[PDB]
Protein backbone atom coordinates (compact mmCIF):
# COMPACT_ATOMS: atom_id res chain seq x y z
CA UNK A 1 0.00 0.00 0.00
CA UNK A 2 0.69 3.58 0.44
CA UNK A 3 4.48 3.91 0.94
CA UNK A 4 4.66 2.50 -2.76
CA UNK A 5 1.96 4.55 -3.75
CA UNK A 6 2.15 7.79 -1.33
CA UNK A 7 5.06 9.56 -3.56
CA UNK A 8 3.26 9.70 -6.47
CA UNK A 9 -0.33 10.07 -4.54
CA UNK A 10 1.49 13.11 -2.76
CA UNK A 11 2.98 14.68 -6.09
CA UNK A 12 -0.48 14.63 -7.62
CA UNK A 13 -2.16 16.67 -4.19
CA UNK A 14 0.35 19.32 -4.61
CA UNK A 15 -0.33 20.17 -8.41
CA UNK A 16 -4.02 20.84 -7.29
CA UNK A 17 -3.33 22.14 -3.98
CA UNK A 18 -6.45 24.60 -3.92
CA UNK A 19 -8.89 21.15 -4.63
CA UNK A 20 -7.84 18.54 -2.94
CA UNK A 21 -10.89 17.14 -1.20
CA UNK A 22 -11.54 13.18 0.92
CA UNK A 23 -15.28 13.06 -1.28
CA UNK A 24 -17.40 10.16 0.95
CA UNK A 25 -19.69 9.73 -1.65
CA UNK A 26 -17.29 8.00 -3.75
CA UNK A 27 -18.40 5.26 -5.76
CA UNK A 28 -15.33 2.63 -5.14
CA UNK A 29 -15.71 -0.42 -3.42
CA UNK A 30 -12.70 -2.27 -4.91
CA UNK A 31 -10.25 0.26 -5.90
CA UNK A 32 -9.14 2.22 -3.14
CA UNK A 33 -9.82 5.65 -2.99
CA UNK A 34 -7.56 8.90 -2.25
CA UNK A 35 -9.12 12.03 -3.37
CA UNK A 36 -10.60 14.52 -5.99
CA UNK A 37 -9.67 17.45 -7.58
CA UNK A 38 -11.18 20.42 -10.67
CA UNK A 39 -11.28 18.94 -14.63
CA UNK A 40 -13.74 19.68 -17.23
CA UNK A 41 -13.70 18.00 -20.76
CA UNK A 42 -14.96 14.93 -22.58
CA UNK A 43 -13.72 12.20 -28.98
CA UNK A 44 -16.28 10.23 -31.40
CA UNK A 45 -16.34 8.41 -34.71
CA UNK A 46 -16.64 9.98 -38.43
CA UNK A 47 -17.63 8.43 -41.67
CA UNK A 48 -15.16 8.19 -44.23
CA UNK A 49 -17.12 9.71 -47.36
CA UNK A 50 -14.52 8.22 -50.33
CA UNK A 51 -16.04 4.57 -49.05
CA UNK A 52 -19.35 5.78 -47.91
CA UNK A 53 -20.11 6.88 -51.49
CA UNK A 54 -18.72 3.94 -53.43
CA UNK A 55 -20.64 1.32 -51.03
CA UNK A 56 -24.18 2.76 -51.34
CA UNK A 57 -26.33 -0.34 -51.00
CA UNK A 58 -25.42 -0.62 -47.36
CA UNK A 59 -26.67 2.98 -46.22
CA UNK A 60 -29.93 0.68 -45.93
CA UNK A 61 -28.34 -2.04 -43.74
CA UNK A 62 -28.50 -1.25 -40.21
CA UNK A 63 -25.62 -3.75 -39.12
CA UNK A 64 -23.57 -1.41 -41.28
CA UNK A 65 -25.15 2.17 -40.47
CA UNK A 66 -25.39 1.67 -36.33
CA UNK A 67 -21.82 0.94 -36.25
CA UNK A 68 -21.08 4.46 -37.12
CA UNK A 69 -23.31 6.13 -34.26
CA UNK A 70 -22.36 6.95 -30.71
CA UNK A 71 -19.24 -2.51 -18.70
CA UNK A 72 -17.80 -0.09 -16.22
CA UNK A 73 -19.38 -2.16 -13.36
CA UNK A 74 -16.93 -4.85 -14.79
CA UNK A 75 -13.46 -2.94 -13.69
CA UNK A 76 -15.19 -2.27 -10.73
CA UNK A 77 -15.23 -6.21 -9.28
CA UNK A 78 -13.15 -8.48 -7.19
CA UNK A 79 -11.49 -11.74 -7.89
CA UNK A 80 -10.94 -13.97 -5.29
CA UNK A 81 -7.24 -15.70 -4.20
CA UNK A 82 -6.97 -19.34 -6.11
CA UNK A 83 -6.33 -22.21 -3.62
CA UNK A 84 -3.09 -23.50 -2.66
CA UNK A 85 -3.34 -26.23 -5.28
CA UNK A 86 -3.79 -24.05 -8.16
CA UNK A 87 -1.03 -21.48 -6.65
CA UNK A 88 1.60 -24.27 -6.87
CA UNK A 89 0.18 -25.63 -10.77
CA UNK A 90 0.60 -21.92 -11.74
CA UNK A 91 4.31 -21.21 -10.71
CA UNK A 92 5.07 -24.49 -11.76
CA UNK A 93 3.88 -23.89 -15.11
CA UNK A 94 4.96 -20.62 -15.45
CA UNK A 95 8.35 -21.05 -14.29
CA UNK A 96 8.53 -24.07 -16.63
CA UNK A 97 7.00 -21.70 -19.76
CA UNK A 98 9.90 -18.62 -19.20
CA UNK A 99 12.61 -21.51 -19.74
CA UNK A 100 11.06 -22.68 -22.92
CA UNK A 101 10.56 -19.28 -24.29
CA UNK A 102 13.86 -17.78 -22.91
CA UNK A 103 15.72 -21.40 -24.47
CA UNK A 104 16.06 -19.75 -27.63
CA UNK A 105 16.19 -15.73 -26.89
CA UNK A 106 18.10 -13.24 -25.04
CA UNK A 107 16.16 -10.51 -22.73
CA UNK A 108 17.58 -7.26 -23.89
CA UNK A 109 16.81 -3.53 -23.32
CA UNK A 110 15.08 -1.46 -25.95
CA UNK A 111 16.58 1.81 -26.52
CA UNK A 112 15.67 5.55 -26.79
CA UNK A 113 16.98 5.19 -30.53
CA UNK A 114 14.48 2.33 -30.83
CA UNK A 115 11.80 4.26 -29.26
CA UNK A 116 12.15 7.58 -31.11
CA UNK A 117 11.68 5.60 -34.27
CA UNK A 118 8.35 4.04 -33.09
CA UNK A 119 7.18 7.43 -32.29
CA UNK A 120 8.17 8.97 -35.76
CA UNK A 121 6.27 5.66 -37.88
CA UNK A 122 2.90 5.75 -35.58
CA UNK A 123 2.45 3.05 -33.38
CA UNK A 124 -0.64 3.25 -31.01
CA UNK A 125 1.87 3.50 -27.29
CA UNK A 126 -0.81 4.96 -25.46
CA UNK A 127 0.33 8.31 -24.54
CA UNK A 128 -0.90 11.97 -23.61
CA UNK A 129 -0.86 15.72 -25.11
CA UNK A 130 0.35 19.01 -21.38
CA UNK A 131 3.65 20.08 -22.23
CA UNK A 132 4.67 19.44 -25.71
CA UNK A 133 2.04 18.99 -28.53
CA UNK A 134 2.52 15.28 -30.13
CA UNK A 135 4.69 12.56 -28.78
CA UNK A 136 6.77 13.54 -31.95
CA UNK A 137 8.31 16.77 -30.69
CA UNK A 138 9.07 15.55 -26.92
CA UNK A 139 10.97 13.06 -28.21
CA UNK A 140 13.63 15.09 -29.49
CA UNK A 141 13.65 17.89 -26.26
CA UNK A 142 16.74 16.80 -24.13
CA UNK A 143 14.53 18.13 -21.43
CA UNK A 144 11.82 14.98 -22.22
CA UNK A 145 14.67 12.92 -21.38
CA UNK A 146 16.37 14.46 -18.25
CA UNK A 147 12.37 13.89 -16.89
CA UNK A 148 12.97 9.99 -18.26
CA UNK A 149 15.92 10.33 -15.99
CA UNK A 150 15.00 11.80 -13.04
CA UNK A 151 12.44 8.92 -12.94
CA UNK A 152 14.43 5.98 -13.99
CA UNK A 153 17.34 6.65 -10.89
CA UNK A 154 13.94 6.50 -8.78
CA UNK A 155 12.82 3.02 -10.17
CA UNK A 156 16.81 1.65 -9.32
CA UNK A 157 16.28 3.04 -5.80
CA UNK A 158 12.51 0.82 -5.81
CA UNK A 159 10.83 4.52 -6.04
CA UNK A 160 8.21 6.06 -8.74
CA UNK A 161 6.71 9.72 -8.90
CA UNK A 162 5.26 10.22 -12.34
CA UNK A 163 4.13 6.54 -13.43
CA UNK A 164 0.14 6.85 -13.37
CA UNK A 165 -2.65 5.62 -15.19
CA UNK A 166 -5.38 7.63 -17.47
CA UNK A 167 -8.49 5.37 -17.40
CA UNK A 168 -11.10 6.00 -20.74
CA UNK A 169 -16.12 -4.48 -22.78
CA UNK A 170 -12.89 -1.66 -23.25
CA UNK A 171 -11.50 0.37 -21.10
CA UNK A 172 -7.90 2.22 -21.84
CA UNK A 173 -5.12 3.05 -19.94
CA UNK A 174 -2.76 6.00 -21.47
CA UNK A 175 0.51 6.75 -19.55
CA UNK A 176 2.89 10.08 -20.04
CA UNK A 177 5.07 9.15 -22.96
CA UNK A 178 8.22 9.14 -20.13
CA UNK A 179 6.94 5.91 -18.62
CA UNK A 180 5.97 4.17 -21.64
CA UNK A 181 9.41 4.47 -22.28
CA UNK A 182 10.34 3.07 -19.06
CA UNK A 183 7.77 0.19 -19.99
CA UNK A 184 9.58 0.04 -23.30
CA UNK A 185 12.94 0.19 -22.07
CA UNK A 186 12.66 -2.56 -19.73
CA UNK A 187 9.33 -5.10 -21.71
CA UNK A 188 9.87 -4.36 -24.84
CA UNK A 189 12.22 -7.41 -26.11
CA UNK A 190 8.95 -9.50 -25.56
CA UNK A 191 7.54 -8.09 -28.64
CA UNK A 192 10.54 -6.14 -30.38
CA UNK A 193 12.40 -9.90 -30.74
CA UNK A 194 9.26 -11.97 -30.74
CA UNK A 195 8.80 -14.38 -28.20
CA UNK A 196 5.40 -15.28 -28.89
CA UNK A 197 6.12 -16.16 -32.67
CA UNK A 198 4.79 -19.59 -34.10
CA UNK A 199 8.38 -20.83 -34.03
CA UNK A 200 9.36 -19.65 -30.75
CA UNK A 201 6.30 -20.47 -28.48
CA UNK A 202 4.57 -23.24 -30.71
CA UNK A 203 1.01 -22.43 -28.77
CA UNK A 204 1.50 -18.42 -30.44
CA UNK A 205 1.07 -16.74 -33.67
CA UNK A 206 2.44 -12.94 -32.38
CA UNK A 207 3.49 -11.41 -35.99
CA UNK A 208 1.88 -13.97 -37.91
CA UNK A 209 -0.36 -12.54 -40.54
CA UNK A 210 -3.97 -13.36 -41.07
CA UNK A 211 -3.40 -15.13 -44.28
CA UNK A 212 -1.06 -17.30 -41.79
CA UNK A 213 -3.78 -17.85 -39.43
CA UNK A 214 -5.99 -20.09 -40.94
CA UNK A 215 -3.27 -22.44 -41.99
CA UNK A 216 -2.27 -22.49 -38.61
CA UNK A 217 -5.20 -23.67 -37.05
CA UNK A 218 -5.88 -26.32 -40.58
CA UNK A 219 -2.24 -28.08 -38.82
CA UNK A 220 -3.61 -28.15 -35.51
CA UNK A 221 -6.41 -29.85 -36.99
CA UNK A 222 -4.02 -32.47 -38.06
CA UNK A 223 -3.34 -33.25 -34.52
CA UNK A 224 -4.95 -36.73 -33.32
CA UNK A 225 -7.40 -35.25 -30.94
CA UNK A 226 -10.83 -34.57 -30.05
CA UNK A 227 -12.66 -31.10 -30.80
CA UNK A 228 -11.16 -27.98 -30.97
CA UNK A 229 -12.25 -25.72 -28.14
CA UNK A 230 -12.50 -21.55 -28.33
CA UNK A 231 -13.99 -20.71 -25.13
CA UNK A 232 -13.47 -16.47 -24.38
CA UNK A 233 -12.67 -15.75 -21.24
CA UNK A 234 -15.69 -12.64 -19.61
CA UNK A 235 -13.40 -9.81 -19.17
CA UNK A 236 -10.02 -10.97 -19.28
CA UNK A 237 -8.01 -8.48 -18.24
CA UNK A 238 -10.45 -7.46 -15.36
CA UNK A 239 -9.41 -11.49 -14.42
CA UNK A 240 -5.76 -10.91 -14.37
CA UNK A 241 -4.81 -12.05 -10.38
CA UNK A 242 -1.96 -10.57 -8.36
CA UNK A 243 -0.72 -14.68 -8.36
CA UNK A 244 -0.78 -13.79 -12.66
CA UNK A 245 1.04 -10.58 -12.12
CA UNK A 246 4.21 -12.88 -9.69
CA UNK A 247 3.76 -15.53 -12.42
CA UNK A 248 4.66 -12.67 -15.09
CA UNK A 249 7.69 -11.18 -12.95
CA UNK A 250 9.41 -14.50 -13.27
CA UNK A 251 10.54 -13.49 -16.41
CA UNK A 252 12.82 -11.47 -14.70
CA UNK A 253 14.99 -14.01 -13.14
CA UNK A 254 16.36 -14.67 -16.47
CA UNK A 255 17.66 -11.09 -17.02
CA UNK A 256 20.83 -9.21 -15.58
CA UNK A 257 22.14 -6.55 -14.20
CA UNK A 258 20.68 -3.01 -14.92
CA UNK A 259 17.95 -4.75 -16.91
CA UNK A 260 16.74 -7.09 -14.02
CA UNK A 261 16.18 -4.23 -12.06
CA UNK A 262 14.41 -1.78 -14.69
CA UNK A 263 12.57 -4.70 -14.86
CA UNK A 264 11.56 -5.95 -11.20
CA UNK A 265 10.59 -2.04 -10.92
CA UNK A 266 8.28 -1.59 -13.44
CA UNK A 267 6.04 -5.09 -12.74
CA UNK A 268 6.68 -4.27 -8.50
CA UNK A 269 5.65 -0.09 -8.71
CA UNK A 270 3.49 -0.14 -11.83
CA UNK A 271 2.10 -3.32 -12.57
CA UNK A 272 1.57 -5.17 -8.81
CA UNK A 273 0.73 -1.20 -7.71
CA UNK A 274 -1.38 0.86 -10.11
CA UNK A 275 -2.19 4.49 -9.45
CA UNK A 276 -4.98 5.44 -11.89
CA UNK A 277 -6.86 9.04 -12.52
CA UNK A 278 -10.59 8.87 -13.91
CA UNK A 279 -13.22 11.55 -14.89
CA UNK A 280 -16.52 12.04 -12.69
CA UNK A 281 -19.50 13.93 -13.98
CA UNK A 282 -20.86 14.46 -10.46
CA UNK A 283 -16.23 16.85 -12.85
CA UNK A 284 -13.20 15.87 -10.20
CA UNK A 285 -10.41 13.70 -11.53
CA UNK A 286 -10.78 10.74 -9.01
CA UNK A 287 -7.12 9.19 -7.55
CA UNK A 288 -7.34 5.78 -7.03
CA UNK A 289 -5.29 2.43 -6.58
CA UNK A 290 -5.57 -1.47 -6.25
CA UNK A 291 -3.10 -4.31 -7.24
CA UNK A 292 -4.39 -6.40 -9.41
CA UNK A 293 -6.01 -6.78 -13.19
CA UNK A 294 -4.42 -5.96 -15.94
CA UNK A 295 -3.05 -1.94 -16.78
CA UNK A 296 -0.17 -2.02 -19.16
CA UNK A 297 0.85 -0.92 -22.42
CA UNK A 298 -1.56 -2.81 -24.80
CA UNK A 299 1.61 -4.39 -26.84
CA UNK A 300 3.31 -5.43 -23.12
CA UNK A 301 -0.43 -6.39 -22.41
CA UNK A 302 -0.69 -8.65 -25.69
CA UNK A 303 2.36 -10.89 -24.53
CA UNK A 304 1.84 -11.09 -20.85
CA UNK A 305 -1.80 -11.64 -21.97
CA UNK A 306 -0.53 -14.38 -24.45
CA UNK A 307 2.15 -16.31 -21.31
CA UNK A 308 -0.97 -16.43 -18.77
CA UNK A 309 -3.12 -17.50 -21.69
CA UNK A 310 -1.04 -20.33 -22.74
CA UNK A 311 -0.39 -21.25 -18.50
CA UNK A 312 -3.77 -21.10 -18.36
CA UNK A 313 -4.96 -23.50 -21.26
CA UNK A 314 -1.64 -25.84 -20.30
CA UNK A 315 -2.77 -26.45 -16.49
CA UNK A 316 -7.06 -26.97 -18.62
CA UNK A 317 -5.06 -29.83 -21.32
CA UNK A 318 -3.71 -31.62 -17.43
CA UNK A 319 -6.61 -31.46 -15.46
CA UNK A 320 -8.28 -33.52 -18.92
CA UNK A 321 -5.52 -36.03 -18.91
CA UNK A 322 -5.93 -36.45 -14.56
CA UNK A 323 -2.09 -35.12 -14.39
CA UNK A 324 -3.46 -33.87 -10.59
CA UNK A 325 -7.02 -34.73 -9.19
CA UNK A 326 -8.08 -31.41 -6.61
CA UNK A 327 -7.22 -27.81 -6.90
CA UNK A 328 -7.34 -28.06 -3.17
CA UNK A 329 -3.83 -29.01 -2.79
CA UNK A 330 -1.10 -30.60 -4.71
CA UNK A 331 0.28 -33.32 -3.19
CA UNK A 332 4.15 -33.97 -3.38
CA UNK A 333 4.12 -37.52 -6.36
CA UNK A 334 1.43 -34.59 -7.61
CA UNK A 335 4.72 -31.73 -8.00
CA UNK A 336 6.51 -34.44 -9.73
CA UNK A 337 4.00 -35.82 -11.88
CA UNK A 338 2.79 -31.82 -12.85
CA UNK A 339 6.88 -31.28 -14.01
CA UNK A 340 7.43 -34.74 -15.31
CA UNK A 341 4.39 -34.09 -17.93
CA UNK A 342 5.93 -30.57 -19.22
CA UNK A 343 9.50 -32.28 -19.54
CA UNK A 344 7.89 -34.99 -21.37
CA UNK A 345 4.97 -33.24 -23.48
CA UNK A 346 4.78 -29.59 -23.25
CA UNK A 347 6.08 -28.61 -25.80
CA UNK A 348 3.93 -31.19 -27.90
CA UNK A 349 0.54 -29.93 -25.90
CA UNK A 350 2.04 -26.24 -26.85
CA UNK A 351 1.50 -27.21 -30.52
CA UNK A 352 -2.17 -27.83 -30.20
CA UNK A 353 -2.95 -24.36 -29.50
CA UNK A 354 -3.23 -21.44 -31.00
CA UNK A 355 -3.21 -18.58 -28.62
CA UNK A 356 -3.52 -14.64 -29.36
CA UNK A 357 -3.72 -12.67 -26.05
CA UNK A 358 -6.85 -13.30 -24.39
CA UNK A 359 -8.24 -15.52 -27.42
CA UNK A 360 -7.21 -19.23 -27.87
CA UNK A 361 -8.29 -22.05 -29.73
CA UNK A 362 -7.19 -25.66 -28.43
CA UNK A 363 -7.28 -29.15 -29.79
CA UNK A 364 -6.82 -31.42 -26.79
CA UNK A 365 -5.87 -35.16 -26.31
CA UNK A 366 -9.65 -35.65 -25.81
CA UNK A 367 -12.89 -34.12 -24.74
CA UNK A 368 -12.75 -34.65 -21.17
CA UNK A 369 -11.27 -31.01 -21.54
CA UNK A 370 -14.67 -30.16 -21.80
CA UNK A 371 -15.46 -30.89 -18.33
CA UNK A 372 -12.20 -30.17 -16.80
CA UNK A 373 -13.60 -26.73 -15.48
CA UNK A 374 -11.87 -26.39 -11.72
CA UNK A 375 -8.63 -24.74 -12.47
CA UNK A 376 -9.68 -22.49 -14.77
CA UNK A 377 -12.91 -21.30 -13.06
CA UNK A 378 -10.50 -21.23 -9.86
CA UNK A 379 -7.80 -19.09 -11.99
CA UNK A 380 -10.97 -17.07 -12.04
CA UNK A 381 -10.62 -17.35 -16.12
CA UNK A 382 -14.55 -17.89 -16.06
CA UNK A 383 -15.79 -18.32 -19.62
CA UNK A 384 -17.85 -15.99 -21.52
CA UNK A 385 -22.03 -16.59 -22.37
CA UNK A 386 -22.16 -20.65 -20.42
CA UNK A 387 -22.84 -21.60 -17.05
CA UNK A 388 -19.96 -21.76 -14.71
CA UNK A 389 -20.06 -25.82 -14.56
CA UNK A 390 -21.82 -26.45 -17.97
CA UNK A 391 -19.06 -28.26 -20.34
CA UNK A 392 -17.58 -26.43 -23.00
CA UNK A 393 -19.35 -26.85 -26.72
CA UNK A 394 -16.13 -27.53 -28.79
CA UNK A 395 -15.76 -27.43 -33.03
CA UNK A 396 -15.69 -30.91 -35.05
CA UNK A 397 -14.56 -28.50 -38.10
CA UNK A 398 -11.38 -26.70 -38.14
CA UNK A 399 -13.30 -24.29 -40.68
CA UNK A 400 -16.08 -23.25 -38.27
CA UNK A 401 -13.67 -21.84 -35.06
CA UNK A 402 -13.50 -18.18 -34.61
CA UNK A 403 -10.31 -16.96 -34.00
CA UNK A 404 -9.15 -13.49 -34.08
CA UNK A 405 -12.42 -11.77 -34.94
CA UNK A 406 -12.29 -14.37 -37.94
CA UNK A 407 -13.37 -18.09 -39.65
CA UNK A 408 -11.30 -19.68 -42.41
CA UNK A 409 -12.39 -21.03 -45.73
CA UNK A 410 -10.67 -23.65 -47.68
CA UNK A 411 -10.49 -22.57 -51.28
CA UNK A 412 -9.38 -24.37 -54.35
CA UNK A 413 -7.95 -22.34 -57.23
CA UNK A 414 -8.99 -23.75 -60.86
CA UNK A 415 -5.14 -25.19 -60.64
CA UNK A 416 -5.44 -26.98 -57.78
CA UNK A 417 -3.50 -25.28 -55.36
CA UNK A 418 -5.27 -24.75 -51.85
CA UNK A 419 -5.88 -21.29 -50.26
CA UNK A 420 -6.78 -21.27 -46.57
CA UNK A 421 -8.48 -17.55 -46.45
CA UNK A 422 -9.66 -15.40 -43.15
CA UNK A 423 -13.66 -14.15 -43.29
CA UNK A 424 -15.91 -12.65 -41.04
CA UNK A 425 -19.49 -11.44 -41.68
CA UNK A 426 -19.56 -8.67 -44.08
CA UNK A 427 -21.54 -5.88 -42.84
CA UNK A 428 -18.60 -5.72 -40.19
CA UNK A 429 -16.12 -5.39 -43.10
CA UNK A 430 -17.64 -2.68 -44.60
CA UNK A 431 -19.27 -0.78 -41.60
CA UNK A 432 -15.55 -0.56 -40.04
CA UNK A 433 -14.43 0.73 -43.36
CA UNK A 434 -16.26 3.43 -43.62
CA UNK A 435 -14.96 4.70 -39.95
CA UNK A 436 -12.44 6.91 -39.03
CA UNK A 437 -10.89 7.94 -36.17
CA UNK A 438 -9.97 11.83 -34.95
CA UNK A 439 -10.92 15.13 -36.75
CA UNK A 440 -8.84 17.65 -38.95
CA UNK A 441 -8.49 14.44 -41.95
CA UNK A 442 -8.37 16.37 -45.28
CA UNK A 443 -10.06 14.75 -48.40
CA UNK A 444 -6.80 13.70 -49.35
CA UNK A 445 -6.32 11.66 -46.13
CA UNK A 446 -9.54 10.45 -45.98
CA UNK A 447 -8.94 8.94 -49.79
CA UNK A 448 -5.66 7.32 -48.72
CA UNK A 449 -7.53 5.83 -45.52
CA UNK A 450 -10.25 4.44 -48.16
CA UNK A 451 -7.45 3.16 -50.64
CA UNK A 452 -5.74 1.44 -47.18
CA UNK A 453 -9.02 -0.80 -46.74
CA UNK A 454 -9.66 -1.57 -50.27
CA UNK A 455 -6.08 -2.86 -50.54
CA UNK A 456 -6.39 -5.08 -47.43
CA UNK A 457 -9.75 -6.24 -48.50
CA UNK A 458 -7.90 -7.23 -52.26
CA UNK A 459 -4.82 -8.99 -50.25
CA UNK A 460 -7.23 -10.86 -47.30
CA UNK A 461 -11.29 -10.95 -48.45
CA UNK A 462 -10.46 -11.11 -52.35
CA UNK A 463 -13.15 -14.06 -52.18
CA UNK A 464 -15.62 -12.02 -51.23
CA UNK A 465 -17.98 -10.71 -54.95
CA UNK A 466 -18.77 -7.35 -53.15
CA UNK A 467 -15.02 -6.81 -51.24
CA UNK A 468 -13.41 -7.25 -54.57
CA UNK A 469 -15.77 -5.25 -56.85
CA UNK A 470 -15.82 -2.14 -53.63
CA UNK A 471 -11.73 -2.50 -53.81
CA UNK A 472 -11.30 -2.14 -57.44
CA UNK A 473 -14.08 0.50 -57.57
CA UNK A 474 -12.12 2.67 -54.62
CA UNK A 475 -8.63 1.84 -55.80
CA UNK A 476 -9.71 3.34 -59.30
CA UNK A 477 -11.60 6.30 -57.62
CA UNK A 478 -8.39 7.35 -55.26
CA UNK A 479 -5.49 8.98 -57.38
CA UNK A 480 -3.20 5.94 -58.20
CA UNK A 481 -0.03 7.24 -57.10
CA UNK A 482 -1.76 8.72 -53.36
CA UNK A 483 0.04 6.35 -50.61
CA UNK A 484 -2.36 4.49 -48.42
CA UNK A 485 -2.31 5.74 -44.88
CA UNK A 486 -3.89 4.91 -41.42
CA UNK A 487 -3.44 6.39 -37.96
CA UNK A 488 -2.85 3.12 -35.62
CA UNK A 489 -0.51 0.32 -37.35
CA UNK A 490 -0.82 -9.03 -37.95
CA UNK A 491 1.35 -7.73 -41.21
CA UNK A 492 -0.14 -5.13 -42.85
CA UNK A 493 1.23 -6.09 -46.66
CA UNK A 494 -1.60 -3.99 -48.07
CA UNK A 495 0.17 -0.58 -46.69
CA UNK A 496 2.68 -0.06 -49.92
CA UNK A 497 2.03 1.67 -53.84
CA UNK A 498 3.20 -1.50 -55.09
CA UNK A 499 0.74 -3.37 -57.45
CA UNK A 500 -1.69 -5.81 -55.43
CA UNK A 501 -1.66 -8.55 -58.02
CA UNK A 502 2.11 -8.73 -57.22
CA UNK A 503 2.02 -8.41 -53.63
CA UNK A 504 -0.79 -11.10 -53.62
CA UNK A 505 0.98 -13.44 -55.78
CA UNK A 506 4.17 -12.43 -53.11
CA UNK A 507 2.00 -13.31 -50.28
CA UNK A 508 -0.33 -16.11 -50.98
CA UNK A 509 2.37 -18.18 -53.41
CA UNK A 510 6.10 -16.94 -52.87
CA UNK A 511 6.18 -16.50 -49.16
CA UNK A 512 3.56 -19.18 -48.36
CA UNK A 513 5.12 -22.37 -47.00
CA UNK A 514 2.41 -24.04 -47.08
CA UNK A 515 2.11 -23.99 -51.31
CA UNK A 516 4.66 -26.21 -52.23
CA UNK A 517 4.32 -25.07 -56.62
CA UNK A 518 5.35 -21.48 -56.57
CA UNK A 519 3.98 -20.68 -60.09
CA UNK A 520 3.07 -16.79 -60.59
CA UNK A 521 -0.94 -15.88 -61.00
CA UNK A 522 -1.12 -13.62 -63.81
CA UNK A 523 -4.23 -12.12 -63.66
CA UNK A 524 -6.98 -11.46 -60.81
CA UNK A 525 -9.03 -13.69 -62.43
CA UNK A 526 -7.06 -16.57 -61.63
CA UNK A 527 -8.46 -15.84 -57.91
CA UNK A 528 -10.94 -17.57 -56.96
CA UNK A 529 -14.26 -16.80 -55.09
CA UNK A 530 -16.01 -18.58 -52.33
CA UNK A 531 -19.10 -20.77 -53.89
CA UNK A 532 -22.11 -17.91 -54.71
CA UNK A 533 -24.14 -19.47 -51.04
CA UNK A 534 -21.28 -19.64 -48.86
CA UNK A 535 -21.06 -15.76 -49.95
CA UNK A 536 -24.38 -15.14 -49.59
CA UNK A 537 -23.96 -17.23 -45.98
CA UNK A 538 -21.44 -14.51 -44.60
CA UNK A 539 -23.40 -11.61 -45.62
CA UNK A 540 -22.91 -11.26 -49.18
CA UNK A 541 -25.49 -9.03 -51.27
CA UNK A 542 -25.01 -10.68 -54.83
CA UNK A 543 -29.06 -11.50 -56.25
CA UNK A 544 -30.63 -7.97 -54.40
CA UNK A 545 -31.34 -5.39 -57.08
CA UNK A 546 -30.04 -2.74 -54.91
CA UNK A 547 -26.14 -4.83 -55.73
CA UNK A 548 -27.33 -5.57 -59.15
CA UNK A 549 -27.63 -1.57 -59.91
CA UNK A 550 -24.17 -1.07 -57.70
CA UNK A 551 -22.42 -3.39 -59.69
CA UNK A 552 -24.11 -2.38 -63.32
CA UNK A 553 -23.23 1.43 -62.79
CA UNK A 554 -19.78 1.13 -60.51
CA UNK A 555 -18.32 4.06 -63.08
CA UNK A 556 -20.74 6.73 -62.17
CA UNK A 557 -19.87 6.20 -58.59
CA UNK A 558 -16.30 6.21 -59.39
CA UNK A 559 -16.68 9.53 -61.71
CA UNK A 560 -18.74 10.72 -58.88
CA UNK A 561 -15.47 10.52 -56.22
CA UNK A 562 -13.04 11.50 -59.44
CA UNK A 563 -15.17 14.59 -59.20
CA UNK A 564 -14.77 15.54 -56.21
CA UNK A 565 -11.02 15.04 -55.11
CA UNK A 566 -10.65 16.83 -58.57
CA UNK A 567 -8.33 16.54 -61.74
CA UNK A 568 -5.03 13.94 -60.69
CA UNK A 569 -4.00 11.25 -62.37
CA UNK A 570 -6.33 7.74 -61.61
CA UNK A 571 -6.01 4.51 -63.02
CA UNK A 572 -9.17 2.38 -63.82
CA UNK A 573 -8.88 -0.85 -61.99
CA UNK A 574 -12.57 -2.17 -63.34
CA UNK A 575 -11.51 -4.26 -66.23
CA UNK A 576 -9.23 -6.72 -63.64
CA UNK A 577 -12.78 -8.23 -63.33
CA UNK A 578 -14.94 -10.39 -66.12
CA UNK A 579 -17.99 -8.37 -66.36
CA UNK A 580 -15.88 -5.24 -66.65
CA UNK A 581 -13.59 -6.78 -69.38
CA UNK A 582 -15.82 -6.04 -71.79
C1 LIG B 1 -28.54 -18.93 -54.37
C2 LIG B 1 -27.96 -17.53 -54.28
C3 LIG B 1 -26.70 -17.52 -53.43
N1 LIG B 1 -27.79 -16.88 -55.59
C4 LIG B 1 -27.37 -17.71 -56.73
C5 LIG B 1 -27.53 -16.93 -58.02
N2 LIG B 1 -26.68 -15.74 -57.99
C6 LIG B 1 -25.77 -15.48 -58.96
O1 LIG B 1 -25.54 -16.28 -59.85
C7 LIG B 1 -25.01 -14.20 -58.96
C8 LIG B 1 -25.58 -12.94 -59.05
C9 LIG B 1 -24.55 -11.92 -59.05
C10 LIG B 1 -23.31 -12.43 -58.96
S1 LIG B 1 -23.29 -14.12 -58.89
C11 LIG B 1 -26.99 -14.88 -56.84
C12 LIG B 1 -26.91 -15.69 -55.55
ZN1 LIG C 1 7.78 5.42 -12.14
ZN1 LIG D 1 -17.01 -16.85 -44.33
Known amino acids: ?71 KEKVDT ?58 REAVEDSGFWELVDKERNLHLEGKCETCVYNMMSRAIWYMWLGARFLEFEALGFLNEDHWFSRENSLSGVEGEGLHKLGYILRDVSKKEGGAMYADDTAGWDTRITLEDLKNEEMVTNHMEGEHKKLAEAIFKLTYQNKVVR ?31 NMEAQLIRQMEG ?45 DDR ?48 RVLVVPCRNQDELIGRARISQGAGWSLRETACLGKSYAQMWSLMYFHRRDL ?41 IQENPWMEDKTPVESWEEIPYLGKREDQWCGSLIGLTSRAT ?33
Open 369 to 416: FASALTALNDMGKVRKDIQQWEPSRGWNDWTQVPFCSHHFHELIMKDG
Open 321 to 365: EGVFKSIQHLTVTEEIAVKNWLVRVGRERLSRMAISGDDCVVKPL
Open 78 to 135: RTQEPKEGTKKLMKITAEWLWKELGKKKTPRMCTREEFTRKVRSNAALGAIFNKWKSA
Open 550 to 582: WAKNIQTAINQVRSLIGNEEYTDYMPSMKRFRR
Open 278 to 308: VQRPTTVMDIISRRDQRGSGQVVTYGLNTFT
Open 1 to 71: NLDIIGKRIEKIKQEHETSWHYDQDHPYKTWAYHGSYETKQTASSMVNGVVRLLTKPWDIIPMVTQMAMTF
Open 468 to 508: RLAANAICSAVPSHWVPTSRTTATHEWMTTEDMLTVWNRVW
